[PDB]
Point group: none
Chain length 114, copies 2
């Protein structure tokens, strides 16, 4: 009741995690562009594919704080509804939006009613 801080940071953090987030992925050798020249224009794109998301795991669900636990679902998941909302829904998902966790043990028989 004497340390009522001043609070300079609290609900405003990532705002200092961006600069430790968006530098990665542009890397190495851009030396002397030895493959210059050109020619023509014709061959189509090649729709990337959702090669965007990393399939899940059974075993590592204890090493995941509500940042790693929760979230996760959002970012991988930020790719999608922005191209499926301008340009160009896997059962792989279906477990993302409804609390719980991917495995419902329906295998075999008993667990009791009460």
């Amino acid at each position: 009741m004497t340390s009522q801080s001043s609070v300079i940071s609290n609900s405003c953090v990532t705002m200092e995690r961006l600069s430790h987030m968006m530098e990665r992925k542009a890397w190495c050798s851009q030396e002397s562009a030895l493959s210059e020249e050109e020619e023509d224009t014709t061959r189509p794109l090649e729709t990337v594919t959702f090669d965007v998301a990393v399939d899940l795991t059974q075993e590592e669900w204890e090493q995941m704080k509500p940042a790693q636990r929760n979230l996760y679902r959002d970012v991988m998941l930020e790719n999608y509804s922005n191209l499926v909302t301008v340009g160009c829904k896997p059962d792989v998902i279906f477990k993302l939006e409804q609390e719980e966790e991917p495995w419902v043990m329906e295998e075999e028989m008993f667990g009791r009613h009460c």
Copy 2:
């Protein structure tokens, strides 16, 4: 014990400065030659309060200790109280919906927030 800091400058400085920022009044008035007085005709036209503000810039705000942020909005929140207390009336601009908790670059795009309590 001892070390009874004669609180030389707590609250006491942002009280003192003045001669330290509000000075940064230039380009001369060196013997005029350009002139002419005339009838007080053509209208004013203010400058408004659209431009007298800064569309908060996306990447910035790393460094700038959020006292250079918290005080910030409270800058363009602190020209506004002539224009919403005595003046000629502008309006509540776009970007405003932040002047607000979390942050400007909050998200709603792409939903979800994965289950927990």
